[PDB]
Design a protein around this ligand. Structure first.
Ligand code: ZN
Length: 140
């Protein structure tokens, strides 16, 4: 698990979104495994506005941060979980690294700030859902 807190926005894995997330839905994209919900408290996270392909992500399944090279946000085919059937996830960035289901919501960051959150794993790969294209997270 894990979320991004920027302005009055909470960003989670759509598949980990709570009843309260859906009651306060701002925006959800099934194909990106992203949901944003409205917060009352102001968030302190800075979203990266950049095209960095290196950073650090938190892996809860190792209680460790890993430096990674990652691919540019792309339409990558994602296999089976139970949360989704087997479909193309958009705005997804792969790196070589450990990603268990419970690693989802771990943050990827570069010097510019938060790049994305863990969304996929398996086969020695870690998918991150990009959030840098969501410029609207940085105003009202
Ligand atoms: Zn960056």
């Amino acid at each position: 698990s894990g979320a991004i807190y920027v302005g009055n926005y909470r960003v989670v894995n759509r598949h980990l979104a709570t009843h309260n997330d859906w009651a306060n839905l701002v925006w959800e994209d099934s194909s990106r495994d992203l949901l944003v919900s409205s917060t009352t408290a102001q968030g302190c996270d800075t979203i990266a506005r950049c095209d960095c392909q290196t950073g650090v992500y938190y892996c809860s399944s190792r209680r460790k941060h890993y430096p990674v090279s990652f691919s540019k946000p792309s339409l990558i085919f994602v296999e089976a979980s139970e949360y989704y059937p087997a479909r193309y996830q958009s705005h997804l960035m792969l790196a070589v690294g450990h990603s268990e289901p419970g690693d989802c919501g771990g943050i990827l960051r570069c010097q510019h700030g938060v790049v994305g959150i863990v969304s996929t794993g398996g086969n020695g790969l870690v998918g991150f859902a990009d959030v840098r294209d969501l410029l609207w997270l940085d105003e009202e």
